[PDB]
Amino acid sequence: PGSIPLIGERFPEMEVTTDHGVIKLPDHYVSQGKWFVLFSHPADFTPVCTTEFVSFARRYEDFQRLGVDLIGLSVDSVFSHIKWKEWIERHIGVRIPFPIIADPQGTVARRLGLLHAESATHTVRGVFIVDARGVIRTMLYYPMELGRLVDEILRIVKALKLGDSLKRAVPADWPNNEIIGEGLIVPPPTTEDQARARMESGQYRSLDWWFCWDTPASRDDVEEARRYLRRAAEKPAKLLYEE
Amino acid sequence: PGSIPLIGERFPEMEVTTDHGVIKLPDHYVSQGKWFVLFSHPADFTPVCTTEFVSFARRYEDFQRLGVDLIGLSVDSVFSHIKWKEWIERHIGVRIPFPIIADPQGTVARRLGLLHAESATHTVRGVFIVDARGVIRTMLYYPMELGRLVDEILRIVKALKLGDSLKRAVPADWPNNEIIGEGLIVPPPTTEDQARARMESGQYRSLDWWFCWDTPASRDDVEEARRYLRRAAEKPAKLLYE
Amino acid sequence: PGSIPLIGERFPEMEVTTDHGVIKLPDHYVSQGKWFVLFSHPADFTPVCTTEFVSFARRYEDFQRLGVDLIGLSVDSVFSHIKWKEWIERHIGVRIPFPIIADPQGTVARRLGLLHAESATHTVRGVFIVDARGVIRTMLYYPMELGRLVDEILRIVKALKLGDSLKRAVPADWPNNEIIGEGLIVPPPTTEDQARARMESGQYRSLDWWFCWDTPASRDDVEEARRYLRRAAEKPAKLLYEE
Amino acid sequence: PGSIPLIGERFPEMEVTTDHGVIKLPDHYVSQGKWFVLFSHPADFTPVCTTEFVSFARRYEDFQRLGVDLIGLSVDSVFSHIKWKEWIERHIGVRIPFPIIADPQGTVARRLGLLHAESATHTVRGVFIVDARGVIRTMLYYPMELGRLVDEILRIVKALKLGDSLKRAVPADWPNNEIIGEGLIVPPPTTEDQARARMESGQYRSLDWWFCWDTPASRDDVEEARRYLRRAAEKPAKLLYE
Amino acid sequence: PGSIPLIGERFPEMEVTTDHGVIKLPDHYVSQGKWFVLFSHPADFTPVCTTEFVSFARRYEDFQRLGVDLIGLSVDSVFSHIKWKEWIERHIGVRIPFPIIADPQGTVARRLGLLHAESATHTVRGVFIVDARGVIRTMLYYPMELGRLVDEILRIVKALKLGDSLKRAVPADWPNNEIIGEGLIVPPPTTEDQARARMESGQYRSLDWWFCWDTPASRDDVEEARRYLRRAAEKPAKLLYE
Amino acid sequence: PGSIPLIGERFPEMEVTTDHGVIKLPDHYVSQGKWFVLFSHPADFTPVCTTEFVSFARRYEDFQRLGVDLIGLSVDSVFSHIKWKEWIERHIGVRIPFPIIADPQGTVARRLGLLHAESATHTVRGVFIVDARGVIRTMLYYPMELGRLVDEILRIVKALKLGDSLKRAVPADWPNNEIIGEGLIVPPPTTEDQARARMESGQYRSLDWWFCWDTPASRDDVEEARRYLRRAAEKPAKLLYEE
Amino acid sequence: PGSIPLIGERFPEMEVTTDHGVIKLPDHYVSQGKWFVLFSHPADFTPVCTTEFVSFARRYEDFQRLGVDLIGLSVDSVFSHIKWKEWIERHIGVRIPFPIIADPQGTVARRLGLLHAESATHTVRGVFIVDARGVIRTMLYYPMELGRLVDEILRIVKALKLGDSLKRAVPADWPNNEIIGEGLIVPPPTTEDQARARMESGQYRSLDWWFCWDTPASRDDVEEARRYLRRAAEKPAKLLYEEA
Amino acid sequence: PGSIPLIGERFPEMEVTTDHGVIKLPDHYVSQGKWFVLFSHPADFTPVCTTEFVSFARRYEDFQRLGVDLIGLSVDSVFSHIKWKEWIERHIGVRIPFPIIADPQGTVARRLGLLHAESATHTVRGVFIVDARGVIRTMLYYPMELGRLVDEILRIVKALKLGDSLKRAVPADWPNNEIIGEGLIVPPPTTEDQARARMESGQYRSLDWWFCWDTPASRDDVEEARRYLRRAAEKPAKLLYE
Ligand SMILES: [O-][O-]
Ligand SMILES: [O-][O-]
Ligand SMILES: [O-][O-]
Ligand SMILES: [O-][O-]
Ligand SMILES: [O-][O-]
Ligand SMILES: [O-][O-]
Ligand SMILES: [O-][O-]
Ligand SMILES: [O-][O-]
């Protein structure tokens, strides 16, 4: 009952107005060889959205370290976006550095399938993780009542880049997988002869011909991914509302 | 693009064949007062899928305690499903307790929008969080090459149930939000008079009329949620491969 | 081109979300015996729009005295509306007392034909004058770059109400028409026998059988309308920017 | 409902028969570098219509001063137009100098959306303000029972021409705006860096980054515009009926 | 009802994924001058299917000697196919040497009309005999509950090849037809003059002008076909379950 | 590129003209509790067709023994059918006892999908096995140049009936299956619990939970089915053309 | 209702399989300058059909003499056709010399509109008389229960051929018309001037300007046509059933 | 091509205007238990048509004897019909006793498929033989240039009536058939059993089981039918033009 773009599809070509100016997607980022996370929120000057913008802003350096840009999206105007950013900087002390798309009319929202059944008027909390070829790699749809876990978005992008670079699949809960820990998975053989050869080689740790794995990720890759989860799990030292 | 069910919609009505038998969704779970997490995986006898089933199985009691059940889905047959579960129990030592839908033909996958552009033949790693009214609450679409973080699925369900119960919205990264910690958010006023009254009352901690919050969650509820995230962050003491 | 509701049609039946709550148009006003002026503006936190809201707010008691309510409309959210009203109150010292419809998505805007070729995303400066039967009586379409003359909106509603009550048509530039001054026009005869009879009566001042008029508006009603125009022509002695 | 031309659109290309001859719109005016006001009226030999033609005629030189031509429109014939003009000149003592389109069958009226619900048979009192590029800049729809305020049409054209030449937006009620008087508005910044730069410049009087203004209009332009409103507000010295 | 390819039509052009790799049909075989038998089965890890694979495996050299390749098909994955082959080799001691198409989603099954009314989800037991020109020559549709007689598939291909090379039609039950034994049938005349001439020629053994036959097949070819049938009728000396 | 009825579907309801009279299918046989084999042939007075009718006629008592009726079908007239039967009895010494549908215009042929790319005008050599509930159980399509093996049709109907009666599946090449000989297969479990319960019972011979079998067929069932194959493989003692 | 080819139309172009082989209609006959009579019958090995084949066979020389070929048609196969012809030769002693189209599936039947409401499965007894230009000239539709009068088919072809060569219309019951006998009709004038000029010429015998005629047919042509009708009226001296 | 009514169909229900008045077909005749021959002709005051009308009128009594009415049809008016009848009676001395349908506009002609490729304007020479049940039994289509053989129309009606009453089929050229003379045919058996029974009964003269016949027609019926053909073949004693 709603159409969405799909993993493995190129991100829909569109021109969009942001509070940093007008840009073409995905080209703006593709043409710079950058991945991007496009996310949406229902409304400027609402509380869960504000908490998410602050969370993304605090993690901005972490996204930058991965060569990943951030871009928001709501049906509010650019004037709203700029006022809301002023409010956040003034009252919370956090500067939001990344652009937000202004989509009054919801033209962009409809193209991304962001209008669900909770609201006719405001987008859900969608997330599109897009690589440097402009291909959609992961999509999340959280609802208006539930803020995202932004560290899982960092883990997703990091693990996708790692997987691409090492030609490996990434196990559940990586880098803390219960079977293979920080190990990464060799894509399984797809022919009988390949399956036989793989075994006869003795090259990898293995549970069966279709489950081979090794540990090609650097300590830095592993501990940075693990850091995101540690941060997610840690009770904050000092809350921002206090000051 | 492709067609999907949407957040806020009733889960589409369907009869499905699982390796535990034939059931009707969402009625089977709604009838038991249960939420369910329906998730898909590309293929039995592939490694990332295997690690995810092991992670869900390990967390199964945690889901049960929340009144949530689990049901998998792939385009493999029930015979495949039963053999794969045999394999996992024998070789990894973990019994998978929950059903898996067998969807050869991809009838169910098409209804759910689980066939994306990565593969013509196998589903992506989709997740539908469905409440006890049978209403879809959250949807996640991970790709073939990346396993899920199952503790986040627990966090999502725990947070949604708390929000529903306490009549509150849940901030980014809860229960470790950097602005309000384990605080929960009062849904914002939608009229000028409501905004003025809310402020005049002095009832809540507030940054503005549209940003009020309090700390209604029990210590037990907060600690349960933090436990999910602590587990996610911790390197396992002993790996099951060993 | 684009589709609009038309003069003499009942105002399109619709439930709308305002910063005062949800209401049904035109019933909300019809059931109170009120006329209403529904006007649109392109965006909250934009300058021409702000000047118009201040102008309408200043004239609010004039509308209320006539039994006319005001209701605004833009594609911005209720949260934006409330924040904008706070800003106006705090910085200009003027409280905006009337509701504004929040139309993110442009559902109401499309229905009303308020999306023109200047902007794909924000409404024009439309005005619908709706009577207490819920019928559209006059429509104005001003562009983004040009603020309305709000005293002409008062003159329109005053003159329409007078014409309705007195069963009279209203000459150009009334109450200062160059031919008949504050005079009002008797609707012309539509048959030959009616035309001949009207002339035979000698009941009215007349230029021909189709042009008869009299002076049935009260001194108070004439002066009220004259006051609107004198205000329009008068330079404020003190400007609100000054304080 | 019904279709109409829209602000920002080029005025619909058409040949029209007037009581001055056949002309092509908007080309006839565009080729002369002139704006035009096209207005309609329900019917020749009706009283409100007559008062409006007299008002436009009285203001003809003011439109000419601005480089704006006038053209009327009704569903009556050219024969009716010429007879009605004779009548007005003889009985009111006013010559109507501008053309009126004759549109029996409402072909042109239908194209411009001038047939509304109050009459199936005669046009409403429409006004299209069209610039020298042929683009529709403002549209007004008054009803058959209420005559226009012609000085507001002058104010509209004057203010639009001023906005275009000075690259400024025009506040409500200009030149008597209650916030900034005869000031004109700088179109607001549309990016965060532009907003910051404008504030740092100190170039403009301002209430916020989105509300900057100055006073670039000449005294002549301001007083001209104010004079249209003064005239609107003035009780006539002598009535033409007398 | 449902749509199927037809006898005399070229086998539907398609790329297919097998547990040996990706191949294009019918080209892969045509380009080698080989016939192929494409057969389907409902599900890996089911018992009738397993018996059939072992039957084809036992006969694989007989097919090879005729210049006929074998290719299987079900809606299971390549991973299932490889695991199932492993199981058969380990438990039955038979290595399945030929590829099996993996058709999850049932794209190929639909194109070949292999989804019938007994199951929405798994194919029937279809057999397509395809010659070296890519043309479909015979089609069989057995049901889930009944295994094929693989020696009749050998008899069919052997008999079609003989009929093609010798320009003869093949009688019921050949090479053991009750009327003419191992005899082969001359295609009947289709005109009066042709019928008259055939009779006047006295060239063939004959029961009437439209029923003429001779014995052109070699002793080797006849004996080969008889051997298929003798094997079908013989109880195995040693059962593989033992 | 052609429509056919499908296994598991009720045989298409139709009234047909045979050389024995008009009957309704499948009702005619269902009402008697009989299975039937409906087979088609391209043309009367052609040689492969004649050999198949003689083969069916010779095996007629074997079909009768199983409670199975035979019915033929071609696009020829009833007159052709009767003449052809006369010819076969006179010239081959064999009486054809079962009816043949006359289908000029190919109405029935089209309903059964019996017109393939080999001939626009004459039916292929189709075989429909239909049970006593009127359901299609197996379909075979042989071409014009290749006669059927009628003993396989007998083995099919015998084995289907046997599987129905005993609630068993039938292995490849039964009763001479290479793995289990004359054994019959228990339909595999379709749930985990059913799979484990079957294994714990120790009720059946078994290679895995999904491969259990037993030997419930009588020696008479087994030896009758084997006899069809033995007959198929036997060189005829005397040829009918000689006689 | 049902669709049929029409008089004045070229016969529907088609390849047909006959018991003489595959030929193209009407080309096969047009190419030889021959007229043809295509006729249909419901079924081989049925009695009215058999009587009509024997009638056409007996009249085959008369048709050939006129440059007219015969071709039959039923929904039966070529094998049936051949066997039926064998039966007729053996039991009646008459060889059928002309081809019969085999139309199982009724493709040709449908195209010629030969399937009526009597039967869904077998053709009616249609007759198409087709000239050397391939044009349909006359169509007859007899029912299953009633055999044709074959001598009327000869009379039709003879008279149309005469009309064509002599530029004349042919009166009712020719050559025994009650008004003008073996006379043939001048096609009527279609304009007033042409009508007036015909009468002023005194060229023809005439009852009015629209009814002029003469006697341009040879004694041989007239007697040939009369012979067909005399044969139709005569009871055979010896019946073929007798000498089986 | 063009559409026509079919043998075995009820004659199209229609109201038609004749020179005798308005009648409903086929009901007018069905009501009387009569058969009818409806025939058409291209045009009144044309010569072939005139000869045919005279031939029908001469045979009127023969049709009446059989209980068969005649009705003509052309696209001419009733006024033309009456004038033409006047002409025929004055100049030929023959009264035309039966009605002719007047069909200007060709509404009936179109309905009966009587407009062929020879003429866009006038009907062919069609003949419908319709029984007392209103059912079309035979149709003939002669062209503009060739008059009908009216005695064959009598023979058709007589023979169809005889076949109906005696439950027999009628051989070619009856009552002068070259195989069986005035014999009539028993409709052939349609089952094997029926074929065998008929042969074993010895009831009928026969050539084979499918060719049985007898002689059930009275001498009166046979000689009457033969007389139609004798009349057709006879050179007229005196020509009416004389
Ligand atoms: O966002 O609440
Ligand atoms: O799944 O790897
Ligand atoms: O509004 O500027
Ligand atoms: O115009 O009144
Ligand atoms: O296959 O059971
Ligand atoms: O049948 O050959
Ligand atoms: O044919 O009877
Ligand atoms: O009719 O000539």
Curated annotation (Swiss-Prot), chains B, D, E, H:
InterPro entries cross-referenced by the UniProt entry: AhpC/TSA, Peroxiredoxin, Peroxiredoxin_AhpC-typ, Peroxiredoxin_C, Peroxiredoxin_TDXH, PRX_1cys, Thioredoxin-like_sf, Thioredoxin_domain
Subcellular localization(s) per the UniProt record: Cytoplasm
Induction (UniProt): Up-regulated by hydrogen peroxide (at protein level).
Enzyme class: oxidoreductase
Effect of residue 49 to S: Abolishes enzyme activity
Disulfides per UniProt: 206-212
Annotated Gene3D superfamilies: Antioxidant, Horf6, Chain A, domain2, Glutaredoxin
Reaction(s) catalysed by this chain's protein: a hydroperoxide + [thioredoxin]-dithiol = an alcohol + [thioredoxin]-disulfide + H2O
PROSITE patterns to which the protein is assigned, alphabetical: THIOREDOXIN_2
Positions with a binding annotation for substrate: 125
UniProt-listed SUPFAM superfamilies: Thioredoxin-like
Keywords assigned by UniProt, alphabetized: Antioxidant, Cytoplasm, Disulfide bond, Oxidoreductase, Peroxidase, Redox-active center
Segments forming domain Thioredoxin: 5-162
Assembly and oligomerization: Homodecamer. Pentamer of dimers that assemble into a ring structure.
Functional summary from the UniProt entry: Thiol-specific peroxidase that catalyzes the reduction of hydrogen peroxide and organic hydroperoxides to water and alcohols, respectively. Plays a role in cell protection against oxidative stress by detoxifying peroxides.
Protein name, entry field: Peroxiredoxin
Curated annotation (Swiss-Prot), chain G:
Gene Ontology biological process terms from the UniProt entry: cell redox homeostasis; cellular response to hydrogen peroxide; hydrogen peroxide catabolic process
Matching InterPro entries: AhpC/TSA (IPR000866), Peroxiredoxin (IPR050217), Peroxiredoxin_AhpC-typ (IPR024706), Peroxiredoxin_C (IPR019479), Peroxiredoxin_TDXH (IPR022915), PRX_1cys (IPR045020), Thioredoxin-like_sf (IPR036249), Thioredoxin_domain (IPR013766)
EC number from the UniProt entry: 1.11.1.24
Disulfides per UniProt: 206-212
GO MF entry, a single one: peroxiredoxin activity
Domain spans labelled Thioredoxin: 5-162
Chief place where the protein resides: cytoplasm
PANTHER family xref list: ALKYL HYDROPEROXIDE REDUCTASE C, THIOREDOXIN PEROXIDASE
UniProt cross-references to CDD domains, sorted A to Z: PRX_1cys
Induction trigger: Up-regulated by hydrogen peroxide (at protein level).
UniProt name for this protein: Peroxiredoxin
Keywords for the protein's UniProt record, in alphabetical order: Antioxidant, Cytoplasm, Disulfide bond, Oxidoreductase, Peroxidase, Redox-active center
Catalytic activity: a hydroperoxide + [thioredoxin]-dithiol = an alcohol + [thioredoxin]-disulfide + H2O
Active-site residues, as the UniProt record annotates them: 49
Binding site for substrate: 125
Keyword Oxidoreductase assigned: yes
One Gene Ontology cellular component annotation held by this UniProt entry: cytosol
HAMAP family: Peroxiredoxin
Pfam families: 1-cysPrx_C (PF10417), AhpC-TSA (PF00578)
Quaternary structure and partners: Homodecamer. Pentamer of dimers that assemble into a ring structure.
Annotated effect of mutating residue 212 to S: Abolishes enzyme activity
Subcellular location: Cytoplasm
